[PDB]
Design an enzyme around this catalytic site. Sequence first.
Site, PDB file in Angstrom:
ATOM      1  N   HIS A   1       0.810  -1.228   0.000  1.00  0.00           N
ATOM      2  CA  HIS A   1       0.000   0.000   0.000  1.00  0.00           C
ATOM      3  C   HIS A   1       0.847   1.283   0.000  1.00  0.00           C
ATOM      4  CE1 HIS A   1      -4.214  -1.572   1.011  1.00  0.00           C
ATOM      5  NE2 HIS A   1      -3.543  -2.478   0.328  1.00  0.00           N
TER       6      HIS A   1
ATOM      7  N   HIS B   1      -1.061 -12.207  -3.609  1.00  0.00           N
ATOM      8  CA  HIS B   1      -2.146 -12.961  -2.984  1.00  0.00           C
ATOM      9  C   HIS B   1      -1.791 -14.464  -2.818  1.00  0.00           C
ATOM     10  CE1 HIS B   1      -5.350  -9.553  -3.654  1.00  0.00           C
ATOM     11  NE2 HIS B   1      -4.393  -9.212  -2.802  1.00  0.00           N
TER      12      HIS B   1
END
Lengths: 732, 735
Positions: free
Chosen positions: B92, B265
Amino acid sequence: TFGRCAVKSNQAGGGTRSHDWWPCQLRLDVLRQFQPSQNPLGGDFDYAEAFQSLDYEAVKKDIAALMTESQDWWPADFGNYGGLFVRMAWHSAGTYRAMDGRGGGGMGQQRFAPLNSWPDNQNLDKARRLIWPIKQKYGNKISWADLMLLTGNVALENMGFKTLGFGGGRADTWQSDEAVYWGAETTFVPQGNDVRYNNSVDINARADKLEKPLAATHMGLIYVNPEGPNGTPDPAASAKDIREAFGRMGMNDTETVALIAGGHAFGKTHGAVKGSNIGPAPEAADLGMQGLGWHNSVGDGNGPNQMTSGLEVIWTKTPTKWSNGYLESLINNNWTLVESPAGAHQWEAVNGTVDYPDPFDKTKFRKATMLTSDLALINDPEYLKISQRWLEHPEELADAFAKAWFKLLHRDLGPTTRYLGPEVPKESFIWQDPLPAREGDLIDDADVDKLKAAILSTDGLDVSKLASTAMACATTYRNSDKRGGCNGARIALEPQRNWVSNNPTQLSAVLDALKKVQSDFNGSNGNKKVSLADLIVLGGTAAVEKAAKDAGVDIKVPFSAGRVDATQEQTDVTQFSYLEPQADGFRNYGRGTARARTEEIMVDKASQLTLTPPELTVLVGGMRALGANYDGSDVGVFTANKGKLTPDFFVNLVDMNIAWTASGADGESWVGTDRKSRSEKYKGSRADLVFGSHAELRAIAEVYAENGNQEKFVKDFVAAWTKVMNLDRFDL
Amino acid sequence: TTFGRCAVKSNQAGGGTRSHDWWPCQLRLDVLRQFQPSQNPLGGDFDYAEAFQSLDYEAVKKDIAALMTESQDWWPADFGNYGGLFVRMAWHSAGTYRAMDGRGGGGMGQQRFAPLNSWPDNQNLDKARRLIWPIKQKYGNKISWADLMLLTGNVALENMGFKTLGFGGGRADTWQSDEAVYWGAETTFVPQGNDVRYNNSVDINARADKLEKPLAATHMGLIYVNPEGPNGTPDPAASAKDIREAFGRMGMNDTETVALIAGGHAFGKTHGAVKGSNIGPAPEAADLGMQGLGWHNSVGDGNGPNQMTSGLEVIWTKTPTKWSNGYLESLINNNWTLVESPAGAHQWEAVNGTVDYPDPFDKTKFRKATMLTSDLALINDPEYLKISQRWLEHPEELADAFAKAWFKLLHRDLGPTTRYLGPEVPKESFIWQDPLPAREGDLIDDADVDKLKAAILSTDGLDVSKLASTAMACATTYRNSDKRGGCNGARIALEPQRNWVSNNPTQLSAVLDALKKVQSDFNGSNGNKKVSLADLIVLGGTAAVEKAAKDAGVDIKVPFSAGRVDATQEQTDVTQFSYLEPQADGFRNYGRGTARARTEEIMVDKASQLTLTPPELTVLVGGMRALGANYDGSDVGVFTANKGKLTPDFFVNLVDMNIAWTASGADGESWVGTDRKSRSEKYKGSRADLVFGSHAELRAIAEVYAENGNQEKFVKDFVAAWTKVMNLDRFDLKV
Ligand code: HEM
Ligand code: HEM
């Protein structure tokens, strides 16, 4: 939609901002103003030095000549800009509030938003532009701040009124001062006052309930509404507003009548055409206006068509010459309520003489006129007595006006040592917070070494008390009007010596001890004499130095000798009441209000001390390490090493093994609990915990909590300490 | 309207109605007053590169690795390993970058300040930052928060079995919120926060390629896209189009996009254990007791099995703490059904699937496979499906692509290779780093520079105006947000810059041919010493300024720092450099703004990217006009009868009250200055010119330089500002 542009820019800061999402969060903006990097003259520029080389008399000569050199783009009334210039100088100085010491002419802020565009400053953009050539000629050697006021002073003297003199010394500022609380209203006069009267429209009853610390009856006005309260042409009610507003500016009844009757000896108001003809104020105007505003579309928009306030009043029959015509007209005429050409309420002597001159036609004359706010001065018992006396004794008005005008212009200039130029008045005035000449010869480094040793081994003194007392004395300083600080040892005098925030019984013991050190030195060292002021600062400074040594850091903490002790006569109890703090974060004193949180008050005070966020942060952490709370408590004292200058405050504040919870209902007290042992370890305040909450403050706290930064913490603390102790040292 | 207004109206610390409230359309200089040295607690003389060089880098990495499995009771680690959380923290931090304006990214460590610390997409990253704080506390000044956030992610990947290419430090911390970034104009966050950026379109497939420039996220408060699908509609095909748009706006292609998503992921899980009503204010809105944290969860201890972050409850692989190909295997080999998470959000489940996905706090309990709508996107777009299917069978190709994309992600805003610090900087040069060659020949000395200056000024087709204009045109491509652009490389001679209309290509070509003749004459005739075209462009401008000063009666040394090299076209990507092309340039009076970015607003934005203060901006514009340095050699703004002489005439004449200024065109971009006595037109001006006589703070500076006797100061200040701008990209030089 208030406060929002219809077009949302996507450059230069455009876009939704942090303050939009979280408008209640503490902002550090006020600690990032007036940065040296932002000053086009450079951080090294010495204004006092520049001004002392100025050809002062030549500047005054050129100003006097300018008064009667009419410029075609804004022709002079009666061929003389004097009245306009007097108004420029009185609006520049006239924003001052005695309580918080903000406003006034000392920063030349009239040339920036928002003051450049307040309704009450309409067409002063023209006035400033008229004197620009003088600024251009003399360059850096006279500031805009000085020039705007000097112009008004010279104008008076060249219209037959000799002033007491003048003092220069106001360094220019380079951005809008967005630290000032002018009010919370979202409209200007004729509105702009619902908040400041808590929605009361009872004009008599509300008059003395004006929101503190405000000193004007509407947002965008200097003091009061010239058409009466909320535009109601009731002179008696206007008088109540005038007393309130002028009182909030630090002026009493005599001063108030002198300033108004003095000022309105000159010039005229302007209300020749209605307001719909008038374009946007300077901050809203298009590029073609080049910093000007209020473009008037009727004719050339000037001369006979001038529109400023909407009133059309000429107070005297000689508007370019000092006289007693204001009081003579005010008292002798019978007044009738009439409309100006722009539609505003004013008063006319409809059966009086038709011998008031027209500003552009020497064959045309008018009847006497007055504002509702002028009639106020004969519609209040105390003002009426003063007006009546000065009608018969105009010399008493002249004396009072010279004194009040000098106060008006110089009330935020600070100590007399700041006043520059060849005609500084010789009289010492109470509002200058005067200081005496020094006693005996100046202590030297050998004297300082002896005194430090004595102070740190005297009954009733220790590191905590010495640091606390020095800081308490220092933080009365405020840069807005350059009042307060350690010079004068005014903590030893009323009212400071009995402020609850100074813990008076403890203070007395500390001062008695320092007075003993003083008495031992004075008279036993020939003609060498040390002031109590110097001893207070030296004691704190010596304590900081020893505390650093104890923490494992050998640093020479500088000390600048030469402070003097004020007398109580020179220390007016009412004037100094305005410096009493509601809260002080450095000594963990006090609490917030319904309008301001404790941490906001701290940031406000820091801005008045000129502190950057790192300076604020390091000073709080060090004061806690020193155990320097006003009451000697352990609130915020997150250290087992009290009196040693370590960054323990920060290390322990950010220890995640401590959980912080509110204890008091008022939001002011917090408990730090060891999550392993489940026992209460610390008590904290909002001033303590903000440094672990606010993301920018916590970023600084982290620096001082980091391994290896223990010496950095000491060096930064000593730099900040020195800065704060020396803020008022304009004598050096 | 209550937006942007506190219910309690403070009367301290800036409380009260403000100037920008009364006149919100007025130009603001805020962005030129950020990041000032006084506000830096480390001090303006702090050299982060020198501090980092002394860091025990290997020890930092060992400590991060240890921390990963040291679960703290106030935020217990999923599967006993914070690796996934740390990878998310780093992705992020880096993931806000927009390629077009070069803003966002991890290079300022802005995740630790408002607004990013409180964006919904950064929920619970406050916990992540708090978990690594002890490392920052241990190593102090020698590693920045900016570097640490990203290195933590890199070290996490490596300790969970994914070897990265390496890492480069060098990101100096910043000390206030960067309020110069246009994140959007919406007054809400996700799940709203996007009416403006789609211009009120709600057709999620049709609108996906029409996202407002330069934005790179589909809602205010998100990193890239909505994990539930566009506007929370769980359509994978439309989600894929949002992903392509958003990642494209961040400078990533299809291969890089699939590599980053499938790569990320592999690790950890999402958190959606309890309803959003149980969650307290974000960090900027939380009480003092939260001490910088936010989103307090009132269910149980608010953490461990009750963790609530995005509202989704997905575990992608059967080994969330170890690199695998489990993500693509599950994605392609399961059949997916639309379900609700415990918090009520849309997600997908393999309801006929193996019940062998591990629970993060019970090593004997298991779940079925799950995926986000934004994961299913990767098999519901033809191009993504091709890549996904290929990497299902060739996971080594995913590994290669992810290593490269992850390195690009973390370092895309770090600037030139010379900025990269530490012992494992990857050796491969990548196009997105805007590579530069090693120098050829020995460095020219002071005597050489003096000879070259004289040669340049006596070369036909070179004059002060053209030299100064060309040097500034080359310099102003620099932007501090991602440290791209500037004079090093002489990229003004390469595509696309040599054809930029704002560079007057026909004139530029002639100027460059002349400088190349100077180069030819010098190189090979001065022993081993060789001068680059890049140095000659800057030296040309610098000699021009020196001469212009001398012609104004002032003898001043104009610094020059040699050592720039010349980039090749192969090192100069057209797409990447097209993003630096200006639509308006105030220094050279080119172009114009639009409704949402006025000419003068673009100038201030550009100034902020050059790190200019208001006085620096002001002096440069005035000097450029004095020099006649407009891009096309026009007289617009050239308010002087001594063009080519370095005087403050621009300011003196601008503020002359005998000149009246009136708009000529309809769009407010052109102005005429008329002598009010003679009634004759004297001057033509632009908005870039006239703003300095309008804005009260800019005009205050114009006045300083217009004041009688400030001639010398003006020259001194112009030279200092010139030097600053010419050297912005000189990261190769020490200090
Ligand atoms: C009760 C407080 C006061 C009120 C309500 C007030 C109101 C006004 C108004 C409405 C104007 C007309 C502006 C225009 O239309 O041009 C004006 C002008 C003027 N004021 Fe006051 N005033 C006050 C006190 C003062 C003070 C204290 C001074 C200075 C000592 C002063 C000096 C002047 C002068 C010289 C003018 C004439 C300006 C010109 O000729 O252009 N006034 N005043
Ligand atoms: C289409 C783009 C992406 C979307 C929409 C997305 C969405 C999400 C969401 C909603 C979460 C759950 C947050 C929570 O509830 O805790 C998450 C977690 C995570 N993401 Fe992504 N993601 C994207 C791309 C990436 C990329 C490019 C990476 C890094 C290469 C990444 C790495 C991670 C990791 C490691 C986690 C697990 C966090 C943990 O274990 O606590 N994601 N993602």
